Every structure is written in structure tokens, then in C-alpha cells.
Chain A
Amino acid sequence: FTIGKAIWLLWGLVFNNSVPVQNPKGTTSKIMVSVWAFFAVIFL
């Protein structure tokens, strides 16, 4: 259910929030995906 959409979600996170993603799953991992977005906002 998530093993396929994970690549799309995570690259959208590290790349640009141009496409909506079905991100909310396992709310505790939201910390990890947010620091992922932090990597994004420093790398760009």
C-alpha cells in the first residue's frame, strides 16, 4: 500500500511540493519525512 507510493512521496518531499501526495500514514514517521523536507530546503 505504501511500498509503491513511497518513492513518489519521498522524492516529492526532497524535490518540490508541486504534486499533491498521499503522505499521512504512520504519523510518527512525519518527523522523518519533515527532516527529509529539511534536506530538500537546504539542498535546493
Chain B
Amino acid sequence: TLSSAMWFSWGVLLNSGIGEGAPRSFSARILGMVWAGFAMIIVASYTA
């Protein structure tokens, strides 16, 4: 999961429906979780 993971993360950066896989561990869970958190906090900060 090298190409699909980067595709999913970089789509999440743009809040896009790119990347449909789910985390295979709670560690990947929290990692993608905080990544998406920072992504949307940045987009909210910029719109404001």
C-alpha cells in the first residue's frame, strides 16, 4: 500500500473522495486521523 496510500492522503488534503481503503491498524488509524485533522484545520484557517 504505497501508491494507494499516498493517493488517499493527498486526496484527503483536498477533501476529495480519492482513496477508499481503511486503516489496517489502530496506529494507521490515528495517523491518518491526525493527518486529516491538520488538513481540514488548515483549510478552515485559510478560508477564514
Contacts and interface: CB of A to CB of B under 8 A. Distances in A.
B17 A34 contact: no
A6 interface: no
Contacts of B14: 34, 37-38, 41
Interface residues of A, number: 14
Contact of B16 (A27, A37, A44): A37
20 contacts: A13-B16, A17-B15, A17-B16, A20-B17, A21-B17, A23-B17, A27-B7, A30-B7, A30-B11, A30-B18, A33-B16, A34-B10, A34-B14, A34-B18, A37-B11, A37-B15, A37-B16, A41-B14, A41-B43, A44-B47
Interface of A: 13, 17, 20-21, 23-24, 27, 30, 33-34, 37-38, 41, 44
